């Protein structure tokens, strides 16, 4: 009786953004587009030209700013239950553990020792090695030991049936990570989408190459990638694109060679 | 083809002369056949033909009887139908 | 009858003020295009006397930058009958049947305004080959293509409405679209030959303040395999060398450097000799 339902729209434009009484062009999804104004409880600065405006019915004005849309498929990737594997359950790869630990944990645990020397810690690792060497085991250990948002992704989970759907969810994944303050992403089986681009003559792998290029641009492009640190697990680190292997995107390539 | 799945494999070879005659009789039951048509002769004239082709021969014999505006399909119509189909 | 805002702006786009004097090596091609477009709509009884129905569709096909869109702009500027400008990729809409409806409205507007031309730039956006295993998007675009084909040469005949379609990948077009009944005259805007390169270079270096003796013949000899846009870029690069040297003019050394620079840039291309059929 007191909280009226709010239909979710998107603020397209702010006509007359000046201090004068403004007007907001909202686009109630699949319903209609309107020119509306703010509720007197909502401050003008709380709403931008891309936020999910969240307007009521009946003179669509009772505003509630609302976060970016995230695909349920993408949002069902955060590691809620942490794996029961620890760094003491991995043996024979001491140096690999040390390097991966540095990259993923230490900046996220003691950033003072890095800002004191003014260093940008490497942000990106590629755990590569034959089938069964501790790649996914070390990823699970990192997820268990990390106090941050761990997002697992499976290379096969970025193959989608409609053009621009793999890249779309890559963008959504990275922007959700950006919304979160400290995020580790872990692309396991990255061989699926990460492959060297070949012209061919029949347009093969164009979609997977497009989603890979979206991942490339999100890892290092015309934008600060944010406080996201990425892991790439693979057992075929010879198909991966050179752009993907560039140390601006995979800084700390680690080899899980067969134990001595 | 593993000998454990197809419980039976039947073979439908191209109809013999007698089989073609039977097919022609069945598929001509449904038209005005002028009295005394040598369906056996038609079957002999069309060797190495399937039941679909026999039915097509019957239909084209009807069509020839139509072309020569007439109410009854005749031996000449069946002959021309066989010639056209094959 | 309604006129879509799309068809309205299609009719009202400004083709600059391009004149036929701004097109070089294209003389035979210009007169074929004019044969198809102008004369049948101005003296429609000569063809009646000879006993033919004048051709309806033109396919300006050729390598990129050879002057297809420039020729279309020149025709649009220099002819009077109604003209409909459209890039085939700007008809495509995500709604169900919307693209076919838009094409239907195009041809309805053309028939309402009887003396009309419809220019479709880069037709291979819509008129691509039909897939036997395509996606739903491909099937929708093929529905659009088939609506277009029916509009050109379907049941209802087209009178005093001409079609021009520009492309540089004619090999990918539907055979039904390339059929003689729909795209009657396929004219090849080929890469400039020696004289065509000379004409284009003169056209694009006329306004440049040259203060030397210009062996346009030497520039043309080194411009083998160039296109009209490449020659325009040769002029622009000569000017760039002028500014970089802090000179308020251009000379043959600058032109030679520019043509060699563009020749080096040409090494990044691929197959360009694409033909219909």
């Amino acid at each position: 009786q007191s909280e009226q339902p709010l239909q979710v729209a998107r603020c397209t434009k702010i006509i007359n953004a000046d201090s004068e009484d403004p007007k907001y062009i909202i686009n109630v999804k699949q319903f209609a587009k309107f020119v509306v104004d703010l509720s007197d409880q909502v401050a003008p600065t709380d709403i931008e030209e891309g936020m999910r405006v969240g307007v009521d019915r009946n003179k669509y004005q009772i505003h509630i700013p609302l976060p970016p849309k995230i695909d349920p498929t993408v949002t069902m990737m955060q590691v809620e239950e942490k794996p029961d594997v620890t760094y003491s359950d991995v043996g024979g790869c001491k140096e690999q553990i040390e390097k991966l630990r540095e990259v993923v944990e230490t900046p996220l645990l003691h950033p003072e020792r890095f800002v004191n020397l003014g260093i940008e810690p490497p942000k990106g690792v590629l755990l590569f090695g034959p089938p069964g060497t501790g790649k996914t085991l070390c990823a699970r250990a990192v997820a268990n030991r990390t106090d941050a948002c761990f997002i697992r992704v499976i290379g096969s989970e970025l193959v989608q049936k409609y053009v621009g759907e793999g890249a779309r969810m890559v963008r959504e994944l990275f922007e959700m990570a950006r919304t979160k303050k400290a995020c580790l992403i872990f692309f396991d089986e990255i061989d699926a989408i990460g492959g060297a681009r070949f012209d061919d003559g029949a347009g093969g792998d164009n979609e997977v190459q497009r989603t890979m290029l979206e991942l490339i641009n999100q890892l290092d492009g015309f934008d600060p990638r944010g406080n996201i640190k990425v892991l790439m697990a693979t057992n075929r680190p010879d198909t991966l694109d050179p752009a993907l292997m560039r140390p601006g995107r995979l800084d700390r390539k680690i080899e899980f060679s067969l134990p001595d | 083809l593993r000998p454990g799945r197809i419980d039976r494999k039947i073979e439908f070879p191209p109809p013999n002369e007698e089989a073609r005659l039977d097919i022609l009789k069945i598929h001509s039951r449904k038209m005005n056949l002028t009295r005394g048509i040598n369906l056996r002769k038609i079957a002999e004239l069309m060797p190495g033909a399937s039941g679909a082709e026999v039915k097509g021969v019957c239909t084209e014999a009807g069509m020839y009887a139509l072309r020569e505006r007439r109410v009854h399909v005749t031996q000449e119509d069946f002959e021309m139908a066989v010639a056209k189909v094959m | 009858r309604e006129v879509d805002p799309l068809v309205y702006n299609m009719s009202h786009e400004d083709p600059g003020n391009v004149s036929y004097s701004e097109i070089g090596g294209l003389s035979e091609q210009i007169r074929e295009l004019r044969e198809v477009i102008e004369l049948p709509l101005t003296n429609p009884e000569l063809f009646q006397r000879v006993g033919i129905i004048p051709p309806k569709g033109c396919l300006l096909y050729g390598p990129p930058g050879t002057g297809k869109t420039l020729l279309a702009r020149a025709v649009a500027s220099q002819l009077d009958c109604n003209f409909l400008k459209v890039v085939s990729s700007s008809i495509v809409d995500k709604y169900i049947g919307e693209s076919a409806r838009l094409i239907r409205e195009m041809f309805n507007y053309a028939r309402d305004h009887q003396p009309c031309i419809i220019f479709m730039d880069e037709i291979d956006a819509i008129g691509g080959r039909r897939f036997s295993e395509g996606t739903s998007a491909d099937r929708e675009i093929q529905r659009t293509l088939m609506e277009l084909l029916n509009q050109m040469d379907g049941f209802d005949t087209l009178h005093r409405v001409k079609m021009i379609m520009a492309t540089n990948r004619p090999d990918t077009l539907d055979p039904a679209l390339l059929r003689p009944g729909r795209l009657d005259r396929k004219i090849h805007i080929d890469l400039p030959n020696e004289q065509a390169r000379l004409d284009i270079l003169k056209i694009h270096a006329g306004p440049i303040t040259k203060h030397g003796e210009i062996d346009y013949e030497a520039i043309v000899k080194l411009s083998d395999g160039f296109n009209g846009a490449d020659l325009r870029n040769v002029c622009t690069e000569a000017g760039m060398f002028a500014i970089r040297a802090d000179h308020d003019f251009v000379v043959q050394e600058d032109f030679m450097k520019a043509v060699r620079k563009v020749a080096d840039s040409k090494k990044l291309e691929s197959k360009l000799d694409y033909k219909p059929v």
């Binding site: 003179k59 260093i119 681009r197 | - | 730039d121």
Partner: protein, 349 residues
């Protein structure tokens, strides 16, 4: 009764409006044929409170919900995706932050900035400024870094499209994205458009009898026409960047679309030393560092690789904890950035 007439007009004109279009403007006295975002076509015998001779087919208007009478004219529609890909908080990277790229900078800076600020040179020389600048480069070098520097040092309207942003389902989309992006750049004051990872959108067309990448091909065709097509757009400059021009379509590389096809090379020894210094300026650098020795050791480190050398040298210092690099931390960083797989080749002579 001006006061009361305005009172009634305001009562009728109170928010919220329904935004519609002016699809057709008939004469009967002028009338509208508006189409409203509820996907409903309403004929208005009286246009409304906006001047009739200010409405053209297709423009966006505000309309009363019930009377469906035009009340206002609204700005043009720009996908919130084409507005979200405009640079507002400018990057901060002086050209001095660029390393072994001096000729490449000069070339870009010329083709992009000079036609914007010193157009008088072009006008007085009777030249058409170069239109598109394509930055090829191996997976490294400074393509995107130079784009960032240009956007920071240009003070114009910068629009960073990126490649895979324009590839969408819902045929017509992507082409609409490109059209809206170029229209926004056109309406704004002098503007640059940066195509990051161009090969995502510009892959070569092909002939296929079973299936093909037709939607992305259509979007690329829309981009081609926007760059150099029927309607000249000489006020919006375009800089693309890519790692593989052997993939791109020939129609996208032609002169007039992307005429300055700059190529970014592997940094030479001096370039590598300069990159080392650029990325080591902000660290606690020891005074005994033979950056020339480091450059000689690098040996085909392309782009980031040198920054990674510096960062990993800092990490190697951080293990012990100190304020130094002493060209042993950098040696170890080069060793661990070469990414050479471990081997027991100590039996070599």
């Amino acid at each position: 009764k001006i006061k009361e007439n305005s009172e009634k007009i305001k009562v009728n004109k109170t928010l919220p409006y329904l935004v519609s279009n002016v699809i057709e403007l008939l004469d009967v006295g002028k009338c509208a044929v508006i189409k409203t975002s509820t996907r409903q076509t309403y004929f208005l015998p009286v246009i409304g409170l906006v001047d009739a001779e200010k409405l053209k087919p297709g423009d966006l208007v505000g309309v009363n919900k019930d009377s469906y009478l035009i009340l206002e004219t609204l700005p043009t529609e720009y996908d919130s995706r084409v507005k979200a890909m405009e640079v507002d908080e400018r990057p901060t990277e002086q050209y001095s932050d660029i390393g072994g790229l001096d000729k490449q900078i000069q070339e870009l800076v010329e083709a992009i900035v000079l036609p914007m600020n010193h157009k008088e040179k072009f006008e007085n020389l009777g030249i058409q400024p170069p239109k598109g600048v394509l930055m090829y480069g191996p997976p490294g070098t400074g393509k995107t870094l130079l784009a960032r520097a240009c956007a920071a040092q240009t003070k114009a309207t910068f629009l960073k499209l990126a490649g895979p942003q324009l590839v969408q389902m819902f045929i017509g989309d992507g082409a609409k994205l490109v059209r809206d992006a170029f229209a926004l750049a056109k309406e704004k004051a002098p503007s640059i458009i940066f195509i990051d990872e161009l090969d995502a959108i510009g892959t070569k067309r092909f002939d296929s009898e079973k299936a093909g990448d037709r939607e992305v091909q259509r979007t690329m065709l829309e981009l081609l026409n926007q760059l150099d097509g029927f309607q000249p757009n000489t006020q919006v400059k375009v800089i693309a960047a890519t790692n593989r021009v052997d993939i791109l379509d020939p129609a996208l590389l032609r002169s007039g679309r992307l005429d300055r096809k700059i190529e970014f090379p592997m940094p030479n020894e001096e370039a590598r030393a300069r990159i080392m210094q650029i990325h080591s300026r902000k660290m606690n650098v020891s005074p005994d560092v033979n950056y020339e020795e480091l450059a000689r050791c690098t040996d085909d480190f392309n782009g980031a690789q040198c920054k990674a050398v510096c960062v990993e040298a800092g990490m190697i210092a951080l293990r012990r904890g100190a304020t130094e690099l002493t060209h042993e931390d950098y040696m170890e960083g080069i060793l661990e950035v070469q990414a050479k797989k471990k081997a027991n080749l100590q039996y070599y002579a």
